[PDB]
Amino acid sequence: TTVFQGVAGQSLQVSCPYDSMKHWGRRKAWCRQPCQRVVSTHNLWLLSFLRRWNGSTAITDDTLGGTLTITLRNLQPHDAGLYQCQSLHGSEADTLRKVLVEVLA
Amino acid sequence: DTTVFQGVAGQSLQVSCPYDSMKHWGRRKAWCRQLPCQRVVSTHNLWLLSFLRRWNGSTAITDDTLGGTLTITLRNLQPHDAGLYQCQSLHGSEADTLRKVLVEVLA
Amino acid sequence: TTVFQGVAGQSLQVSCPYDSMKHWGRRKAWCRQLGEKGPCQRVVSTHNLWLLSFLRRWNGSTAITDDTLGGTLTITLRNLQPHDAGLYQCQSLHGSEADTLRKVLVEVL
Amino acid sequence: TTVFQGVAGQSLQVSCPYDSMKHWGRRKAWCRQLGPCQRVVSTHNLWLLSFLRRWNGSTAITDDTLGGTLTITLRNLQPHDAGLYQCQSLHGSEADTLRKVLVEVLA
Amino acid sequence: TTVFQGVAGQSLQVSCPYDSMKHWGRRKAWCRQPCQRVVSTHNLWLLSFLRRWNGSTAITDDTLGGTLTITLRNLQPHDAGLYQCQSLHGSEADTLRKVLVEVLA
Amino acid sequence: TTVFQGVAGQSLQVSCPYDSMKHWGRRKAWCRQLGEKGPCQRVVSTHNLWLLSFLRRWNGSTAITDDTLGGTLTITLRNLQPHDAGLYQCQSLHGSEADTLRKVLVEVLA
Ligand SMILES: *[C@@H]1O[C@H](CO)[C@@H](O)[C@H](O)[C@H]1NC(C)=O
Ligand SMILES: *[C@@H]1O[C@H](CO)[C@@H](O)[C@H](O)[C@H]1NC(C)=O
Ligand SMILES: *[C@@H]1O[C@H](CO)[C@@H](O)[C@H](O)[C@H]1NC(C)=O
Ligand SMILES: *[C@@H]1O[C@H](CO)[C@@H](O)[C@H](O)[C@H]1NC(C)=O
Ligand SMILES: *[C@@H]1O[C@H](CO)[C@@H](O)[C@H](O)[C@H]1NC(C)=O
Ligand SMILES: *[C@@H]1O[C@H](CO)[C@@H](O)[C@H](O)[C@H]1NC(C)=O
């Protein structure tokens, strides 16, 4: 597990490394813990660089470097908890990283 | 603060400007001189080709939007090129400053 | 050891030459070494496909490109800060071993 | 005749500006004074691919023909690399000196 | 109306900037003041970088950076006058810039 | 003819520059010359697919690779031994023929 803390009201940047060759062709998803799915990368894998949003949560993927980037805009106290980066393939979903987010003031 | 770059006259000077790639996602960049900030060069009008080097006179510019770095080349640097400049990020008709740069020329 | 020094807040370019024939076909890595035979932690490596070594790979604020014809490995430390100073290794990968191409001290002015 | 100073064991970049319209369509070369100037590297035989890096030994050359900048890279600079060199613009069978360069190796 | 001044018997380089995306696909012309056409860029717009000559006048176009370059080789007093850079579209021609060429001994 | 000397037991690198435009599309070969314009015993040649000329090709402890853009052929003699010494040709191949790019004397030192 990894912990990311950010000041309230600002953007928090969560980085998620993976093996770019192992997960080649797979979309990624950001979910919160069951595991409520928040956002996934674009349906067209060659457009994984595209920033996609759910509310004030953005996801973007560098598939050459193997870096998945989740952005949390306007970090509120409610946004603390436990989340997962996952790699989707068919119906299954391997966890890439489990992430705990903290807020400060 | 304002970064200082030093180059020898008659040689090429590479000025770099880091920025946050998420904050400025999708935004073109520009390079201008202070006299007001007079525009010198901007990156490609199509953001997905920001890596393509654009020239204006002896100044070139390229953008690496994934790494979050803007690179400006001052070709054949001359003492009259010394002065104050700005890396900017454009959206709508506003120009957010990313870095103030001071260019010094030597012997 | 070779010393590279740069101004803080500006990009620093580090180049490691190597024998292109001895390390033909090998991927490269840049790593940070904290002990004479210390952990030596991976920072960034070249493309998983060796014929695409020339493509810039980013990890964080570090970029790597390899010129396998000239035998020159180029590392870019973007926005150099004091915490970047220290000892690093250019390494050539084969199997699960890494051979040292060059030891590099990064100093920050 | 400009002086380019480089640290030994590191790659030294020599940059060489030229009038891009007066040398249009022309190949460029790097040579070392010995005395006659002996040819080291030249740019791509096809002028429209001059941007493509060409190596001879520990010397590389690339040409940006739009901006009018020629770049030479001395790889792994050694003490025996110091000396006088020349950027040349080729046309027919004559070579015009674009820039005389003194290379200085430090330590 | 910008002024360009060049010593007689030597090359004068006249540069006209323009908006590259606005003029995408359009060829350019150099005209002398009606407006008598002197030289225009290549018929194949993807070869606009090609230097075209009319006598001692040459024209070349950088469609990526949006810079048109006119060269008056071996400038002579009878080349002084008022000129125009133009963008050709369909059958019309829009003035990019008006250029005053001046010569010195 | 130029001499390339190496110490016995270590890799020796031979270089053959050539006019990359003149020899565009031609494979290259390293062969041992045993007579006055006579037998050229072929040792190793670059890849049969010319766009793959960068590929390292082996015969025993001898390797060849070709930089067709810069115009440089590289022969590697790994673990140089006395039986490697001799007169060699760098060749440019076309049809059934061969143009001599360079003549090389390989010498071994203990
Ligand atoms: C956005 O996140 C909420 C939070 O659970 C979820 O209910 C909703 O379905 C998401 N939107 C989309 C389009 O998936
Ligand atoms: C180049 O500079 C001129 C004036 O300095 C300006 O009119 C032109 O639009 C510029 N071009 C670019 C691509 O910035
Ligand atoms: C980037 O760094 C992280 C740890 O900081 C590591 O997990 C990942 O493998 C690295 N990426 C590459 C391509 O080396
Ligand atoms: C490289 O330079 C050397 C002189 O230092 C020369 O003999 C050789 O021919 C050059 N290479 C090419 C491909 O011309
Ligand atoms: C340019 O060419 C046109 C016809 O293409 C001709 O009428 C004109 O005289 C020429 N101008 C010069 C300066 O040669
Ligand atoms: C290796 O070279 C010898 C001559 O030295 C030759 O007879 C043999 O056929 C070569 N083998 C291959 C696989 O090319």
CB contacts of A67 in chain C (<8 Å) are: 58-59
E89 CA distance to ligand 5 middle (Å) = 21
Query: Which atom of ligand 5 is the closest one to the Cα of E57?
Result: 13
Tokens coding F75: 């022969």
Q: Is A36 in the pocket of ligand 1 (CB under 6 A)?
A: yes
Nearest by Cα to A89 from A27, A36, A44, A34: A27
For D1-107, CATH gives 2.60.40.10
CA C15 to ligand 2 center in whole angstroms: 35
Domain boundaries, chain A: 1-105
β C57-59/C62-67 pair status:
antiparallel
Q: Which CATH number fits domain F1-110: 2.60.40.10, 3.40.50.300, 3.30.930.10, 3.40.190.10?
A: 2.60.40.10
- List the determination method: X-ray
- E51:D22 CB<8 A: no
Residue A46's SS3 state is helix
SS3 A105: coil
**How far is it, in rounded angstroms, from Cα D97 to Cα D88?**
5
**Ligand 3 pocket mutation pick from C28, C43, C46, C56 by most atoms within 8 angstroms of CB:** C43
Q: Which candidate, A53, A24, A55, places its Cα nearest to that of A41?
A: A53
Ligand 3 in contact with C44 (CB < 6 A)? Answer: yes
The secondary element (H helix, E strand) that includes residue F39 is: none
From E29's Cα to the closest Cα of chain D, the distance in A is 18
D99 is in an annotated binding site: no
Asked whether residue D26 is marked as a ligand-binding residue, the answer is no
> Residue C32: beta bridge partners?
C41, C88
If you count residue pairs, one on B and one on C, with CB atoms under 8 Å apart, how many are there? 24
Tell which residue, F56, D100, D106, has the closest CA to residue C24: F56
Quote the CA–CA distance of D21 and D72 in Å, as a whole number: 21
Helix H, strand E, coil C: the string for chain C is: CEEEEECCCCCEEEEEECCCCCCCCCCEEEEECCCCCCCCEEEEECCCCHHHCCCCEEECCEEEEEECCCCEEEEEECCCCHHHCEEEEEEEEECCEEEEEEEEEEEEC
Q: How many CB atoms lie within 10 A of CB A68?
A: 26
Q: What is the DSSP string of chain D?
A: -EEEEE-TTS-EEEEEE--TTTTTT--EEEEEE---EEEEEE--SSGGGTTS-EEETTEEEEEETTTTEEEEEETT--GGG-EEEEEEEEETTEEEEEEEEEEEE--
**CATH superfamily label, C1-109:** Immunoglobulins (2.60.40.10)
* Type of residue at C53: S
Encoding tokens for residue C63?
A: 């970029």
Long-range Cβ pairs for the range D8-11 (8 Å, 24+): D8/D77, D8/D78, D8/D79, D8/D105, D8/D106, D8/D107, D9/C2, D9/D76, D9/D77, D10/C2, D10/C4, D10/C15, D10/D76, D10/D77, D11/C15, D11/C17, D11/C72, D11/D73, D11/D74, D11/D75, D11/D76, D11/D77
User: Cα separation of D11 and C75, whole Å?
Assistant: 12
Enter the CATH code of domain E1-105.
Answer: 2.60.40.10
* B7: enclosing H helix or E strand: strand B2-8
Name the closest residue on chain E to residue B60, using Cα atoms.
Answer: E65
Instruction: Compute the distance from residue E102 Cα to the ligand 2 centre, in Å.
Output: 23
User: Which region, left, alpha or beta, applies to residue C40 given φ > 0 means left and ψ of -120 to 50 means alpha?
Assistant: left
Residue type, B4: V
3-state secondary structure of E36: strand
Helix (DSSP H) and strand (DSSP E) numbers for chain F:
0, 9
- List residues in chain D touching B: CB distance below 8 A: 2, 4, 15, 17, 64, 66-69, 71
Top mutation candidate among B33, B35, B39 for ligand 2, by most atoms within 8 Å of CB = B39
Using alpha carbons, list the distances in angstroms from residue B59 to B71, F63, F78.
11, 46, 49
Q: How many residues does chain F have?
A: 110
Residue among B4, B5, B67 whose CB faces C78 most closely: B67
* CA distances for C20 relative to C13, C48, C76, D76, E14, angstroms: 20, 18, 21, 13, 47
Most D CBs within 10 A among B51, B52, B75, hence the mutation to make, goes to B75
Chains that touch E (3 or more CB pairs under 8 A): B, D
Query: Rounded to an integer, what distance in angstroms lies between the CA atom of residue C5 and that of residue E62?
Result: 38
